[PDB]
Design an enzyme around this catalytic site. Structure first.
Site, short mmCIF file in Angstrom:
data_model
loop_
_atom_site.label_atom_id
_atom_site.label_comp_id
_atom_site.label_asym_id
_atom_site.label_seq_id
_atom_site.Cartn_x
_atom_site.Cartn_y
_atom_site.Cartn_z
CG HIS A 259 1.68 14.14 14.12
ND1 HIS A 259 2.14 12.85 14.32
CD2 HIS A 259 1.63 14.32 12.77
CE1 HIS A 259 2.35 12.28 13.15
NE2 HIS A 259 2.05 13.14 12.19
N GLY B 235 0.87 12.14 5.25
CA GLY B 235 -0.38 12.63 4.69
C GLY B 235 -1.44 11.57 4.98
CB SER C 43 3.13 10.80 9.36
OG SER C 43 2.00 11.25 10.08
CG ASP C 44 -0.56 7.84 5.19
OD1 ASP C 44 -1.06 6.89 5.83
OD2 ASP C 44 -0.86 8.09 4.00
#
Lengths: 1023, 1023
Positions: free
Chosen positions: B708, B880, B927-928
């Site tokens: 990120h 997300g 990620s999510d």
């Protein structure tokens, strides 16, 4: 696919040149070529500095390349840097603000009119500290400066003139040389134009076509021992440059080298350099024309030679399937449209059905068409051409039928009755061949019987015919209601509001419908009878004004009105004429406004839809029944697609055809055109940019060897125009600070004639400028750049006076101050004349023969014409058409005086000059400016002093633009003087007393021309 | 002044590379360097064709380089030509649509997701006829393809990862090689990321940092015999390329050559190439921030780190005399303004008097300030920093005083009473350290006594405090009016309209002023007493809604309201939240609309003037008394002026400081930042373009070796984005005609999920496209370019079916069709699962964990959750934050049913999955999506099938942009799993059953992952 190569310079084995608007460098030793600078805009000149380390570059910006400034390119680090922030004005024929030369110390010497009252005053300045400061040489206007054996060599007007081969006028290039530290002699003054002078060894090399074609010649530093070094016959050589040993130049797209030692000419083999994408995209609105309403609320418009049918939002768009150059498009039927398609052979009528997709073109060559309409039933079109004919063309057979032919001008103003039976049109005519005024009468053509009828007498200007829906009355406009309006400054009157609408009932016995004669009091009936209808004419009860269109409706009449306004903006800035749509209620005779801020107006076939163009430049549509429901036509949702090479060929051919067709001498035109056609068309495929194309079209235009062959407008780049910030002040770098060397002011009470600082109560002259908007300016901060960045806004400027005086002011930073510099120059000459003449002589300057000329002439005439003598200065006069008006005034002879019981004597005529007159002219006065100078002498108004004028007197009246907007001009109206004939063209007007304005004159601060005029008048006034 | 050189390729003695976003060529033999292609947009890659004659080029366009397409450069004629009209999406970390390699015949192979339902599916295509046709190789997603001894070598995810050093996630670059025509084996799969593979002889060379730093390694074609060829320690090597003999690469701004033979490394000496003008001009509105009203009808506004004071028209403008990064500006007095000035050391307060011009800055470091206000009497300012402190700062001594400090979030919502006595602010708090929700209570600070009082309880979210003019009542808003709203698609409810305003009289005994209690019936008087003020709170009679601001006036209360709306546009397209200004009449309780289409609102100190930003992006100003007298604020009459090198230094410093300050682990942040600062700061002066700066910033960001660390937005070029025309169809050139190979449709009844041709009643599959807008497309007419030229409009498309069927339709040519392709893909998978499972298994795909994921998860969940089994496919999941909401649903256990008299059984819970679940994940889920994959296994929802996920679970919440609009992100929130700790980061999640998706699987048209999931469930469903 080779490129068009141009304008080189050379240093050792390194040559630089232009290709595709960018700068390239070629190494003769390695044979490699490379682009060294690009994406700056259009570069037309590049000069190596003496040590060949740096290069001075001139680049143009603005769609039409109307602005220019200079840059420096460092070959060592590849650093590029803008040096001037003058935003110098530029035209293809006068690309000013450029490199003039380099002094013995290696400093750049530029030529620019940026800080002068006239574009022809391209003064020399030494550039210091990369543009921080500019030091004037005070050698007067010049193009080039060379230094040899410690002396200065000055080239005046020595830039190339590709648009005028064989030029021999007063502005031809000339070379002057210094003979004694401050004394100059004219050493090269030939019959023809000298350009691009350079020096090798101890000879001055230059170009000229005295022998019939451009060639490289040379003379010694004395202008003696003329020699011819080349015998070119293909294309004219251009842009000489040298490193002191070899000479470089371009010719017909190639770069060549001339070695003075061997007199050998060798072409440089460069090869294919760049081939950009041929298929381009354009914004339709930027080249739009002929917008028109179709059925079903659809619209038609032409752009860049292409035509389209679309909904108002521009979401559903159809391109008319026809090759290049559709000139006009008109509603033909429910889903049909008629159009004029042009080719190298001429214009043809065609039809296209956007529903079915069937498109047909007729083979009848209609000539060059300037107007086209279609009857409401779609059976025939009406066409007008430059043959001055108005004809019908059967939309089924394509068979044309000439209705009538004027011998004065085109019949572009016509209308067709809704029942398709009558065709009314304005017919331009003259009683005699040499009448000064062309009259226009409305004629009516009856499709049945094919006979022409006169709707109005031949005494004035009748126009804008319009039939009512029922085809029973013919309405039209006339400039017949004479009534004078008074000039508020000069004793004069003029017809300003004399337009009035009239109506003619097509059936005898029937009354003017707008009179409201009770039906029961009128014996109706009657058959059509167009005989003696002018006797039946009747005016409609509308106040006189300036009307341009009349639309008769059921119970009202719409009228396009134009309020009285000044012409300055429309004349110089292309500002459109603003109008208003008025509504006249027939029932109550009440007039109301329907729409304002208009510049054009189209009306639906069925009279239900109205299309207008407003001053904001946008197109709108609205129902004639509810003008509140207005919508904006959008055309840029869909990109315009096209081929550069297809367009370039089409454009070359049209430029070529226009030059042939519009040249004043038809006999000559045929031979010239055919002789040059292929020579230049063969260079078209080498063109990749609009600028390249320009270099080709202009050389072809020059083959006509006549004045006024111009190339204006068009789109050459997408770069925004350069910006310059001004406050009507000259700055001098003193130490680490800029000082206001001079603050300009003409007439303090007039608008826009002084540095905005004067409105704060002080004269900034001698003040130091500390900072602008908090940013310090001076030795380390270019003030010109800072002003450029603030142009068009008000910035806080901190000024310091000699003492403790400090000022902090919000000053309007202007985008230009030419007019202020001009008026100041004028007022200075005025005081000087009064002072030197001891109050006996008056002064007036006429900058041009257009709207500015009229302003400035009267501005001083009302105050200067009653001294004992009068100096009329027309130096730098840019021409126009009002020379005859000003002459008429100067011709007044004072023959009387009114004697009042109280007050002073009033001379008669009021507009008469009291005493002796003398005129000053120079090589920069031309065209109508030539005519004024010649007439002043011919009519014996007085003596003419100065130098021979420009010598260009074949006028122009352009009526067609290229697909990219370019406006080409063709010398179409040759001026002929009684006794002198056409002899003014390509020569000019010799003054009675020739008084040169030499470089040493400028060096001493003396204007020998004005001094002689003052002195000569003082002498004449002795008795 | 050298340049930053990057991304080179080599052929013999010629090396091409990028410098200043343009392409250059350097000859090792002659030492000459030259720019061969410029002004195309930003070039990041260039590849020589096999024979070294043509060059394939990737260029990006769009302010943020969000679009890309390829061109061909031909050095022979200098021809430049666009090959693709896809307008592929691009980000700095995924610069897709690029050259992938060249086949044995020398044909270009490209990699692109342009025609796929996911950006990660960068499929391979052989290019034909310069882009006329594209032939898919069907080898699945790939970055590079090489050919050796006839067999294909495939590089997956093999592009450079400068923003993530040490990456070891599931998406790491891997290499596969063909062993049997059509059969592939994975040969290079290391713990770290492999990038830029090349082949020399029979060895594959590539880059990886498995030993701690980027180095060049190699293996045999079997992936064995690993060798390390370099030992760099300064900068990571990047972009390997080869001509088959030597290897070229970039490192720290220089170009180097690696000789596989000698193993020797040589730096190529290129030198100073280009130095563009440093002083640039920018449009103010394009980088505008903080706009505020000042006295005298003046305005204050910040842009690109600069601040200005100006009149509404922007004619009179004053720049605040302070160096870079003025963050905020607020009215401080009659002709005074307070501002926050940020430097590398932190943020400071300053004051500037625009009348006198005196500016002062205090030395107190306030930390990183995110809010600032000034009392109406100009004695002190209120500031909030990222320390979570709210404090006052004496405007005379600059002495700051901390009022209170939150331990949860910043105190940016505050207000100051008109008498300067109280400061009310929203105070974030939590009852316990691990609470899921942060509450916010209003606190009031009394300057007299310096004590804090609680205005509200700590049970919900209280905000927007505002005192009335007389400083007698404190008004505010709360989200306390709980009342649920029903979901229209799913059994669900949510609090949408629960905002209510409240008021607290500061004097006990005084009633709520909006209750209109008669004065004569109220015992007035009393002194201020802020104790127990929450007990005295009273609501105002305004219906609940969604309010963001309350402004109490004399006889009315203004309220900023935001209508309930969907989040999609704001979440993905940056769309601003739209609001309305309402007026509540206290007397009548009547509410009226004062202004709509707002996006921001600022109120003046005296409450007389209102400034707003509307949805159109423009700033307006109107008197609170007559909102009809609205004026537009113009800020672009005067250009913004700045220096590139000054800005680049300030931006690198801020990027470096943000990376350090926000990194999740402070301990580690100090050591890393200090270790990397100089190394990258030294490359800053080599940068000349925004792209150059990005390369440097991103490399320094990657030193954090964490997920990120992104760089989004910003302005890199002035080139309009590439355009592409789409109709959701795949075309195949068959003979001389394009045939619609496939027409896409998801759910026919949904909006935007099918080719627009379906709306005309036919399926275009198999149809031949004859022409578009009258232009023939086919063998010699690129249909892609034609569509590109029509994107965003409706064009006439002619089609031909096999027979005599002919269609002529006006089709909407779309700008994009990714979503259509996505839904078609999902619906196809859905049908496939139903069919292969014989109606026993359902299917759901979750494309990301944002709003799109929510839409798509439920779009199918409502239909697929009741089969015996369920496949939950999260492949390509973009992350997300809604993973937890989706798991919550998936966790529901069906434990009962309602049995109705009529109709069918209703399951309980309604949102429960009927049977067995199985999940599918891959390396493109992260990620999510990593969090979801891990949780699925952890909670025992079912088996996880596929390949190891991305492995990036350190979240972000950017709150600062660079002066040019750039949004940098810092991994600020590390996710920790019970039992697994921080371990998912830089690794990912392993599936229970690993199922690779090999190249030969794509070749055979089989999806091994979905097949296994289906078969696995069928088995589990046996018993």
């Amino acid at each position: 696919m080779p490129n068009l190569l141009l304008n080189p310079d050379i240093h050792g084995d390194r040559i630089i040149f232009v290709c595709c608007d960018d700068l390239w460098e070629h190494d003769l030793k390695s044979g490699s070529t490379r682009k060294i600078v690009s994406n700056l805009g259009v570069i037309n000149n590049a000069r190596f500095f003496p040590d060949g380390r740096k290069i001075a570059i001139r680049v143009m910006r603005g769609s039409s390349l109307n602005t220019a400034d200079l840059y420096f390119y460092n070959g060592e680090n590849g650093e590029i840097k803008r040096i001037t922030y003058f935003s110098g004005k530029s035209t293809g024929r006068r690309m000013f603000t450029d490199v003039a030369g380099f002094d013995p110390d290696g400093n750049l010497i530029i030529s620019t009119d940026a800080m002068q009252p006239f574009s022809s005053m391209t003064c020399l300045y030494r550039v210091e500290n990369d543009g921080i400061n500019f030091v004037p040489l005070n050698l007067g206007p010049a193009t080039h400066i060379l230094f040899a054996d410690g002396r200065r060599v000055i080239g005046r007007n020595t830039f190339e003139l590709p648009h005028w081969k064989g030029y021999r006028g007063g502005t031809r290039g000339k070379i002057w040389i210094e003979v004694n530290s401050g004394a100059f002699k004219k050493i090269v003054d030939m019959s023809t134009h000298v350009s691009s002078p350079v020096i090798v060894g101890h000879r001055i090399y230059f170009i000229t076509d005295i022998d019939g074609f451009g060639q490289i010649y040379s003379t010694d530093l004395d202008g003696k021992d003329l020699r011819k070094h080349t015998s070119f016959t293909d294309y004219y050589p251009r842009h000489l440059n040298t490193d002191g040993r070899r000479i470089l130049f371009s010719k017909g797209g190639s770069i060549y080298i001339f070695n003075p030692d061997t007199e050998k000419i060798e072409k440089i083999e460069i090869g294919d350099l760049e081939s950009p994408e041929d298929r381009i995209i354009s914004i339709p609105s930027k080249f739009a024309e002929d917008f028109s309403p179709l059925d079903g609320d659809l619209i038609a418009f032409v752009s860049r030679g292409q035509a389209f049918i679309q909904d108002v939002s521009g979401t559903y768009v159809l391109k008319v399937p026809e090759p290049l150059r559709i000139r006009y498009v008109r509603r033909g039927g429910d889903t049909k449209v008629a159009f004029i398609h042009g080719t190298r052979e001429g214009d043809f009528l065609g039809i296209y059905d956007y529903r079915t997709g069937k498109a047909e073109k007729f083979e009848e060559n209609l000539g060059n068409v300037f107007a086209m309409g279609v009857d409401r039933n779609g059976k025939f079109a009406v066409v007008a051409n430059d043959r001055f004919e108005i004809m019908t063309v059967d939309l089924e057979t394509g068979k044309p039928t000439v209705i009538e032919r004027s011998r004065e001008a085109m019949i572009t103003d016509f209308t067709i009755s809704d029942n398709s039976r009558f065709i009314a049109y304005g017919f331009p005519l003259k009683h005699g061949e040499t009448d000064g005024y062309v009259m226009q009468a409305i004629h009516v053509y009856d499709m049945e019987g094919r006979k022409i009828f006169a709707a109005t007498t031949e005494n004035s200007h009748d126009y804008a015919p319009a039939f009512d829906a029922d085809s029973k009355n013919l309405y039209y406009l006339s400039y017949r209601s004479l009534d004078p309006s008074p000039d508020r400054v000069v004793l004069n009157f003029s017809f300003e509001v004399v337009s009035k609408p009239f109506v003619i009932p097509l059936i005898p016995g029937s009354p003017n419908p707008t009179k409201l004669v009770p039906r029961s009091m009128t014996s109706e009936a009657g058959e059509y009878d167009l005989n003696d209808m002018y006797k039946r004419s009747s005016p409609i009860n509308v106040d006189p004004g300036d009307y341009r269109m009349i639309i008769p409706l059921e119970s009202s009449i719409l009228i396009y009105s134009v309020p009285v306004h000044g012409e300055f903006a429309a004349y110089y800035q292309g500002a459109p004429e603003k109008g208003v749509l008025l509504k006249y209620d027939v029932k109550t005779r009440k007039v109301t406004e329907v729409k304002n801020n208009l510049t054009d107006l189209r009306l639906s076939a069925d009279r239900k839809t109205v299309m207008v163009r407003k001053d904001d430049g946008k197109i709108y549509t609205f129902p004639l029944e509810k003008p509140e429901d207005e919508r904006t036509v959008e055309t840029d949702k869909r990109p315009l697609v096209s081929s550069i090479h297809e367009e370039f060929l089409q454009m070359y051919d049209e430029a070529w055809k226009l030059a042939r067709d519009n040249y004043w001498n038809e006999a000559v035109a045929k031979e010239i055109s055919e002789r040059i056609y292929e020579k230049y068309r063969n260079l078209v495929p080498l063109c990749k940019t609009r600028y390249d194309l320009s270099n080709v079209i202009v050389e072809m235009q020059g083959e006509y060897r006549t004045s006024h062959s111009y190339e204006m407008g068009g789109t050459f780049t997408d770069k925004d125009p350069f910006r310059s910030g001004r406050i009507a002040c000259d700055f001098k770098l003193d130490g680490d600070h800029y000082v206001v060397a001079k603050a300009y002011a003409g007439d303090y009470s007039n608008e826009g004639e002084k540095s905005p600082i004067f409105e704060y109560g002080i004269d900034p002259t001698g003040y130091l400028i500390e900072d602008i908007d908090g940013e310090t300016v001076g030795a380390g901060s270019n003030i010109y750049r800072v002003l450029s960045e603030k142009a068009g806004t008000s910035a806080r400027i901190r000024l310091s006076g000699k003492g403790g005086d400090k000022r902090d002011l919000m000053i309007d930073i202007l985008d230009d101050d030419r007019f202020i510099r001009y008026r100041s120059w004028v007022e200075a000459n005025r005081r000087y004349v009064h002072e030197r003449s001891k109050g006996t002589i008056g002064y007036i300057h006429i900058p041009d023969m257009g709207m500015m000329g009229l302003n400035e002439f009267y501005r001083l005439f009302i105050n200067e014409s009653s001294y004992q003598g009068l100096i009329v200065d027309v130096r730098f006069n840019g021409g126009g058409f009002v020379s005859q008006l000003i002459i008429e005034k100067l011709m007044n002879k004072r023959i009387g005086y009114d004697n009042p019981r109280r007050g002073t004597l009033s001379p008669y005529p009021t507009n008469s000059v009291r005493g002796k007159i003398i005129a000053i002219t120079n090589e920069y006065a031309g065209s109508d400016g030539d005519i004024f100078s010649f007439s002043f002498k011919k009519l014996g108004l007085g003596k003419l002093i100065g130098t021979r004028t420009w010598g260009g007197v074949v006028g122009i009246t352009p009526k067609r633009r290229l697909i990219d907007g370019t406006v080409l001009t063709q010398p179409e109206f040759a001026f002929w003087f009684r006794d002198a004939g056409f002899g003014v063209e390509n020569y000019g007007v010799d003054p009675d007393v020739e008084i040169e304005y030499a470089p040493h004159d400028y060096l001493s601060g003396k204007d020998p021309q004005i001094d002689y005029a003052i002195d000569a008048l003082i002498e004449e006034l002795r008795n």
